[PDB]
Amino acid sequence: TPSMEDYIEQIYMLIEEKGYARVSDIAEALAVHPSSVTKMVQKLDKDEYLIYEKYRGLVLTSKGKKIGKRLVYRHELLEQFLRIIGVDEEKIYNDVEGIEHHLSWNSIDRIGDLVQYFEEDDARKKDLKSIQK
Amino acid sequence: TPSMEDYIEQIYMLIEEKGYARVSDIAEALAVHPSSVTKMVQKLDKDEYLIYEKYRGLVLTSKGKKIGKRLVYRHELLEQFLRIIGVDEEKIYNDVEGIEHHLSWNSIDRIGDLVQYFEEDDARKKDLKSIQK
C-alpha cells in the first residue's frame, strides 16, 4: 500500500544516511504526528518489513531492503528527471511524491533513458536551458 | 474535483471530434455505468459547467470550455511526452490519467519545453531511440 511505501522509503533513506531511523525522524520527515507513526511502525513490524526496537531505532528486513531500494531508486530518478528538465527545486519533492505511485515501470524505465541521455552530454543541458524564452 | 475533471475532459474531447456528446459515449469512454454518468452529468449541469439536453447530447458552457481546454491540453502534452520518450502505446493513457492531477503547472510547463526540444529536431529522436540497449 502507498501508505506503507512512503514509510519504507523514508526508513530506507534515514538508514542510508544515518545507520538507523528514530521514530521522531519519521514523524517530522512526513509531517505526520508521532502518534500515527507509532501505529504504522508496529504494523509494518508485524508484516516483516522492519523491526522496531525502542531506543535503538528502526531496522529494515530483507523484505524491507528489497522494497526500500526499489522505491527510493524511482523516487530519486523522478527527482533527478524533474531537475534536468528544469523544475523549481522547491516543487520537485511534492510532485514526485504524487506521481511515483501512478507510473508504470515502463515509463520509469524510459525516463531512465531520458536522464541517461542528458547526463551523457552536459553540452545538451544547454539547448534545453535556453528554450525558457 | 478530479472526478468532475475527467468528465470535463471526456466531454470536451467528444465535442471537439463529434460536435456533441451523447450520454452512452461518456458511459463507455470512462468504463463507468451510465447510471453514475447520469447523476454526475446533471450535477455538473447544476454547477454551470455544461447543459444536459436529452436527445441533444451535452454542451459545455464558457466555464466548461475554459477548464476543458486546459485539462485536455496538459493531458495531450503528457501523452505526447510519454510517446516521445518511448513508452508503449497501450500504457500511455492509464499513466497520464494517474499523473495529470498530481503535477504542478511548472512541471507541465517544463515538460512542454522538453517536447518542444525533440520536436524542433527529429534528428534527435534518433539518439534517444538507440539507448534502448
Curated annotation (Swiss-Prot), chains A, B:
Keyword Cytoplasm tagged: yes
Alphabetical list of PROSITE patterns matching this protein: HTH_DTXR
Disruption phenotype: Null mutant is very sensitive to manganese. Mutant also displays increased sensitivity to cadmium.
Signal peptide: none
Compartment(s) of residence: Cytoplasm
Protein residues bound to Cd(2+) 2: E9, H75, E97, E100
Biological role stated in the UniProt entry: Central regulator of manganese homeostasis that regulates the expression of both manganese uptake and efflux systems. In the presence of high levels of manganese, it mediates repression of the manganese uptake systems MntH and MntABCD and activation of the efflux systems MneP and MneS. Binds with high affinity to the regulatory regions of its target genes. The manganese concentration required for activation of efflux is higher than that for repression of uptake.
Family the UniProt entry places it in: Belongs to the DtxR/MntR family.
UniProt remark on domains: Contains an N-terminal DNA-binding domain and a C-terminal dimerization domain. Contains two metal binding sites per subunit, site A (corresponding to metal ion 2) and site C (corresponding to metal ion 1), which both contribute to the metal selectivity of MntR. A large metal cation is needed at the A site to correctly orient and position the C site ligands. Smaller, non-cognate metal cations bind at the A site, but disrupt the C site, blocking the full activation of MntR. Binding at the C site also favors Mn(2+) and Cd(2+) over other metals.
Protein name: HTH-type transcriptional regulator MntR
Species: Bacillus subtilis (strain 168)
Organism taxonomic ancestry: Bacteria, Bacillati, Bacillota, Bacilli, Bacillales
Gene name of the record: mntR
